C-alpha cells in the first residue's frame, strides 16, 4: 500500500544503462585526479619554455550584467579600441607585448574607461621589453643587465603589475541629517514607481477627458 509520499518524477526510462543489449549513455570521473596532475604538468612546462614571459596576458576589468550582479566586477576578454587610443598604444602592436585586445567592446561610460586606461599605463611602466637585437638596440628598450634581472610571473590571473579589481570603499560612520530624519522614503519611491506603472492608464483618462 502506498501512503503519504511525494509523486516521484524520476526521469529514467531512456535506455541509459549498459547491458547485454544496450551500449548505454554514461559518464564517469575515474580520471579526475589523473587529469588534475596532467594539467599542472603542462602549465609548468609552458612556463619553462616561454620564460620570462608572463603566464597569462593582461585583461581589462568589466561590470557584470543584470540586476543580480550589478555590483560585481570581473575580468574581460580584451581591451577596447578607445582605451588603447587613450593610452597611446597601437592595437596590432599591443597584441605583440602580451595585451589582449577586443574589437567589440563599447565603453559606454567614463568610469569603466578610466579604470582600464590606468591598467594599461601601469603595465607599460612595468614592462622591460627585451631588445630584438642585442648588438644594436633601437628605441627605448631594456639596458644591459636589466635583461638578467627579469623574472617570470605566475599569478594565475596576471596581476603582478596591475593588481586586483577596483571597487569603491565602504562608507564611514556619520550623523543623520535633519532632512534625512523627516523625509518619507517609501512615499518618495512609490510615487516614482507609480508614474511608470500607471503611465498608460493616466494618458487614457486625459485623452477621454480631452
At closest approach, how far in Å is the CB of 121 from RNA?
26
Dihedral sign for Cα 178, 184, 189, 192, please.
negative
**Of 174 and 200, CB closest to another protein:** 174
- How many angstroms separate the CA atoms of 95 and 104, rounded? 15
Task: Find which of another protein, RNA, none residue 164 binds, CB within 5 to 8 Å per kind.
Answer: none
Q: Pick one of 96, 180, 206, 210: the residue that binds another protein (CB under 8 A).
A: 180
Task: Find which of another protein, RNA, none residue 74 binds, CB within 5 to 8 Å per kind.
Answer: none
CB distance 74 to 51 below 8 Å:
no
At 58, is the secondary structure helix, strand, or coil?
Answer: strand
Name the DSSP letter for residue 176: -
Distant-in-sequence, close-in-space partners of 117: CB < 8 Å, separation ≥ 6 = 83, 86, 87
Window contacting RNA (CB under 7 A); options: 16-24, 92-100, 120-128, 200-208: 16-24
- Taking the CB of residue 120, how many other CB atoms lie within 10 A of it? 21
Applying the rule CB under 7 A, the residues between 131 and 170 that interact with RNA are 132-134, 136, 154, 156
Dihedral sign for Cα 198, 204, 208, 210, please.
positive
CA angle (176, 181, 184) in 5-degree steps: 135
- How many angstroms separate the CA atoms of 208 and 210, rounded? 5
DSSP element (H, E) containing 38: helix 32-49
Task: Find which of another protein, RNA, none residue 175 binds, CB within 5 to 8 Å per kind.
Answer: another protein
- How many angstroms separate the CA atoms of 7 and 156, rounded? 48
Task: Find which of RNA, another protein, none residue 92 binds, CB within 5 to 8 Å per kind.
Answer: none
Applying the rule CB under 8 A, the residues between 181 and 210 that interact with another protein are 181-182, 184-186, 188-189
At closest approach, how far in Å is the CB of 23 from another protein?
13
Task: Find which of another protein, RNA, none residue 133 binds, CB within 5 to 8 Å per kind.
Answer: RNA
Applying the rule CB under 7 A, the residues between 50 and 109 that interact with RNA are 72, 104, 106
Question: Residues 57-86 vs another protein: string with x where CB under 8 A?
Answer: ---------xxx-xx---------------
Q: Which residues bind RNA (CB under 7 A)?
A: 5-6, 8, 10, 12, 18, 23-36, 38-40, 43, 72, 104, 106, 132-134, 136, 154, 156, 184-187, 190, 193, 197
Amino acid at each position: 500500500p502506498k501512503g503519504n509520499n511525494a509523486i516521484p518524477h524520476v526521469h529514467q526510462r531512456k535506455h541509459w544503462n549498459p547491458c547485454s543489449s544496450q551500449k548505454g549513455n554514461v559518464k564517469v570521473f575515474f580520471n579526475q585526479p589523473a587529469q588534475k596532475q596532467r594539467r599542472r604538468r603542462l602549465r609548468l612546462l609552458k612556463a619553462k619554455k616561454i620564460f620570462p614571459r608572463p603566464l597569462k596576458a593582461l585583461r581589462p576589468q568589466v561590470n557584470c550584467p543584470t540586476v543580480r550582479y550589478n555590483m560585481k566586477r570581473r575580468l574581460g576578454r580584451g581591451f577596447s579600441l578607445e582605451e588603447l587610443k587613450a593610452a597611446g598604444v597601437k592595437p596590432r602592436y599591443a597584441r605583440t607585448i602580451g595585451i589582449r585586445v577586443d574589437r567589440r567592446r563599447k565603453n559606454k561610460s567614463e568610469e569603466g574607461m578610466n579604470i582600464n586606461v590606468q591598467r594599461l599605463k601601469t603595465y607599460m611602466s612595468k614592462l622591460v621589453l627585451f631588445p630584438l637585437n642585442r648588438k644594436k638596440p633601437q628605441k627605448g628598450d631594456a639596458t644591459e643587465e636589466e635583461v638578467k634581472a627579469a623574472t617570470q610571473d605566475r599569478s594565475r590571473y596576471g596581476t603582478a603589475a596591475v593588481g586586483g579589481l577596483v571597487t569603491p570603499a565602504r562608507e564611514a560612520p556619520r550623523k543623520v541629517t535633519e532632512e534625512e530624519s523627516t523625509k518619507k522614503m517609501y512615499k518618495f519611491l512609490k510615487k516614482n514607481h507609480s508614474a511608470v506603472r500607471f503611465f498608460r492608464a493616466r494618458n487614457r483618462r486625459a485623452a477621454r477627458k480631452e
